């Protein structure tokens, strides 16, 4: 692909394939030319080395990339390792409908509630708001709804307050040591930029309010909402799965 300014970025597989093709063509040319056997043997050894470096690089001499010293990245290096497909993309995807911010105290909340800023809620729930706006007749076409949301009119806030009503969200802290690092709450729209976390769940989360951050996800499908409300809800997880002792002790 091209980059801004006419510079190109490419993958090492192109270099490895080009080397293999060049050596193969030269071997064909030599064979068609009846060269002395020593040259032919040298060419055959070179082609062996090129193909072996293409398949799994680093088992003989680790051919290094041109205009650089780093060894090239072969086919087998993409599958394996902590940065391969299996562990980097096939088990650890990134997802849509999510954000993060800093967490605050909010001691007035109930055990099943969390404070969610208006801006984050609007950005996370846009499509639901478009649907509601079109359904109610306020916006004739989806482009009209998009413009209305961008302009931030009062009806937009009313529709958001209506669509955020009984829709739970998931909150997650960075090191997820056990299953209580994910729980579902019912958002309460607030003004500001930091999330509000009930004091009683801090022990389970292992959270302190000196700079910690949290992530928020939105369950889309209807079965996902039912699972969030009936399995992960914050008022369902009171006992430790490791031992039956409570985990909502006042700290």
């Amino acid at each position: 692909v091209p980059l801004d300014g006419g510079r190109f970025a490419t993958s090492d597989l192109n270099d490895l394939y080009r080397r293999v093709i060049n050596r193969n063509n030269r071997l064909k040319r030599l064979l068609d030319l009846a060269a002395p056997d020593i040259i032919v043997r040298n060419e055959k050894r070179m082609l062996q080395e090129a193909v072996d470096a293409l398949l799994d690089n680093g088992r003989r001499g680790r051919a290094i990339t041109g205009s650089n010293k780093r060894p090239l990245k072969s086919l087998a290096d993409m599958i394996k390792g902590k940065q391969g497909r299996f562990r980097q993309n096939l088990l650890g995807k990134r997802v849509d409908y999510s954000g993060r911010s800093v967490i605050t105290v909010g001691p007035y909340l109930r055990l099943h509630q969390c404070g969610l800023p208006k801006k984050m809620a609007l950005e996370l729930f846009k499509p639901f708001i478009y649907g509601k706006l079109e359904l109610r007749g306020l916006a004739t076409t989806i482009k009209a709804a998009k413009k209305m949301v961008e302009r931030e009119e009062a009806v937009v806030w009313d529709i958001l307050d209506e669509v955020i009503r009984e829709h739970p969200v998931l909150l997650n802290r960075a090191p997820t040591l056990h299953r209580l690092g994910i729980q579902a709450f019912e958002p309460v729209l607030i003004e500001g930029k930091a999330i509000q976390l009930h004091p009683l769940v801090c022990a389970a989360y292992n959270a302190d309010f000196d700079g910690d951050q949290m992530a928020v996800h939105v369950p889309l499908t209807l079965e996902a909402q039912l699972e969030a409300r009936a399995l992960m809800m914050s008022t369902n997880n009171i006992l430790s799965p490791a031992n039956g002792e409570p985990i909502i002790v006042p700290s």
């Binding site: 040298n42 050894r45 070179m46 080395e49 003989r60 001499g61």
Partner: peptide, 13 residues
């Protein structure tokens, strides 16, 4: 011989 792996040394030999 020392069982070298470098094709350059072999060709030189």
């Amino acid at each position: 011989i020392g069982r070298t792996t470098d094709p350059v040394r072999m060709y030189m030999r």
